[PDB]
Amino acid sequence: GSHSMRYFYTAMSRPGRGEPRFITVGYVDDTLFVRFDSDATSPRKEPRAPWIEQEGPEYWDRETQISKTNTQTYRENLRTALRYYNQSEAGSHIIQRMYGCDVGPDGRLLRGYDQYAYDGKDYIALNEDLSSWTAADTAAQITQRKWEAARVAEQDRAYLEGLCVESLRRYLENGKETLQRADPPKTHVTHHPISDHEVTLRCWALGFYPAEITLTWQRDGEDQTQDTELVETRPAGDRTFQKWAAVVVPSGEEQRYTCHVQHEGLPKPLTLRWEP
């Protein structure tokens, strides 16, 4: 179906403990495929997925250089941010960036992204039109003015419509065994007596990929959204994810509850119930 490629940057200052650390991780959908850490013994882009290993040595040298240059540029970005916000050089600060593209089943660009944050808050972001910007405050507005003057959006757009989609398409083909395979969730409902008046029904979804999934409990056909405990989807460590939804139900009324599961790896949504 649809696919995405995203690069995530994290630049962290640490006054008194050396220069700011710069990390980059790259993903195709929910699969990590490349990493870079300026604190590494010999910093360089490293493969994290089998299908990216075939990229030649030229690819790795070029990718590593981009990250090394980025390390220096983001340390300067951090210094600039301090000025824009009138902050002292004593505190630790963080700049983050997420950029990339989404493509459809046919491989055409669905939309591009280039978003930035400062200390966990929106800073500036490229609009979906790939030609204008949205600045979060008067500080980011200064960056916006510089970027509008330098036609940055036009350059981002060229990358997003070109190399971004072209490389993603190559990665999808080279990694079609995994990137183009959805693993359906293995499901089951557990029963845990709480007391004489209530019992807990927990609906499990395990071993699925991608991470996107919907788990809901219904009581007599009515969604129990407000009464369902939903844990955040979590990684199993073997590429797959896990998730569960629980509800407290009155003793003897277990059969009035049904768990519904939706996942792209499932031809049709599943309906489960406690099976004593």
């Binding site: 980059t24 824009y84 700049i95 940055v152 190399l163």
Partner: peptide
């Protein structure tokens, strides 16, 4: 593949 152009804040 990454975009090799970085623009200063």
């Amino acid at each position: 593949e990454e975009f090799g152009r970085a623009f200063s804040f």
